[PDB]
Amino acid sequence: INAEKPNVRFKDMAGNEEAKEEVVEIVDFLKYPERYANLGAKIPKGVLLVGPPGTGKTLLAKAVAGEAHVPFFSMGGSSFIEMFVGLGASRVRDLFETAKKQAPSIIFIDEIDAIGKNDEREQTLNQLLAEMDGFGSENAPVIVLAATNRPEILDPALMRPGRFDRQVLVDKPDFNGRVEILKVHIKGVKLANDVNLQEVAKLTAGLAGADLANIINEAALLAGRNNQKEVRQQHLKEAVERGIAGLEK
Ligand SMILES: Nc1ncnc2c1ncn2[C@@H]1O[C@H](COP(=O)(O)OP(=O)(O)O)[C@@H](O)[C@H]1O
After folding, report:
1. What class does CATH assign to 173-249?
2. What distance in angstroms lies between residue 21's CA and the mean position of ligand 1's atoms?
């Protein structure tokens, strides 16, 4: 129904050490929440996340949850754009319902700029700003975390203080970004002794990170595919073949 404790922890993410400093507070907010209540603070209620596709926006959210040991709740970004005029947006009115009971906890809204621009479609929106303003208790600490691609078209309303009042920007890894991921995801794979990792970090430039992680696997299956038992630098090179976003008309 509604519960999924994450086992991710900050390490699982490579690069972005600044990006994550920016969410360290969020963890101390869920770990020792009484320390601010017994002192009269006002824990923010929702941090935004902005970068290109497959880069940690989700992973980082889950890391936070995970370090804090607090439940994590997902929100189908593209799920509330395939409904009709009737049965909808109540998954919002219940997502917090379950969050508030097992609080401290965390809502994650991947692709918020998918429902943050008929009797729709601001149906799912307008009702987000409801459960996120109030409503019946201030005591239990629940932090929504949303992610977005183009925060340019991001609905102006959502950054009005009390909602997504701050953000944490994080984009494509640099070169040393690429090496760290590449290194992260290399673990567990048999390797070739002729694997110039830096080399791939270099044929790979302006690539997401999810993609890197993928490249490593496309490599490795291509391996087992022709039976070879190494995963040679040739294979990695041979991968980076999926590094083709293709035509989309
Ligand atoms: N810095 C990173 N270190 C390790 N893996 C990463 C990193 N960034 C992205 N990934 C990989 O990308 C995949 C998920 O993409 P995600 O970041 O969840 O999407 P988005 O960034 O669009 O929310 C994860 O399985 C993760 O392994």
Report:
1. mainly alpha
2. 17
